Amino acid sequence: VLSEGEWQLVLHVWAKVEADVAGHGQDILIRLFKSHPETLEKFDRFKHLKTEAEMKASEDLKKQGVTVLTALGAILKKKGHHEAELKPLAQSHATKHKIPIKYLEFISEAIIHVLHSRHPGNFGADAQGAMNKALELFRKDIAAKYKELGYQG
Ligand code: HEM
Numbered sequence: 001v002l003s004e005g006e007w008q009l010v011l012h013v014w015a016k017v018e019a020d021v022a023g024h025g026q027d028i029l030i031r032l033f034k035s036h037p038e039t040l041e042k043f044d045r046f047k048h049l050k051t052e053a054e055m056k057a058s059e060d061l062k063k064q065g066v067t068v069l070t071a072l073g074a075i076l077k078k079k080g081h082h083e084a085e086l087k088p089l090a091q092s093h094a095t096k097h098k099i100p101i102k103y104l105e106f107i108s109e110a111i112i113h114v115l116h117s118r119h120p121g122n123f124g125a126d127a128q129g130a131m132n133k134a135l136e137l138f139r140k141d142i143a144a145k146y147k148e149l150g151y152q153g
Contacts, residue, residue, distance in 0.1 A: 007079045009130035013122040025065020030055045032110040090145035101143050101153030108135040
């Protein structure tokens, strides 16, 4: 369970993401695909992209980055009270997209990497620890839902 002070560190860096969620989403997805290229294979819409340049020019990838980060932002703003938000997300990602917990760890690592690079003014050590806690809680609750849904993540 996160403290309110930890939630505020999470929400204060998310406020900067929201200055330009599209640009942050491009950076985060591209970082994920460069660090863990196997994850790109899950996105049938744009798994054909070969280079970071193609990735940056992809309108579909940009829209996906907005979709991801906006859904995650809604979850974070619930400050752990995210049962309703996790239901459809767990179901689609367990059953339709088939995203292992290991890949949610990968995208969490990409989010932390991009925030560390872009936002040193709001992502010092304490803030990064709070974000890690929030993302661990997200993955913990998602993994429990995966099991309820019949998916070993
Ligand atoms: C913070 C973690 C994540 C969040 C909040 C998130 C959120 C979403 C949302 C809102 C959608 C659209 C609605 C839906 O299908 O449920 C979506 C679609 C999708 N997600 Fe995720 N996602 C996350 C992580 C991942 C990861 C790590 C992968 C793959 C490695 C992935 C693969 C996909 C795919 C393939 C789609 C369908 C894209 C398409 O329409 O072609 N997701 N995600």
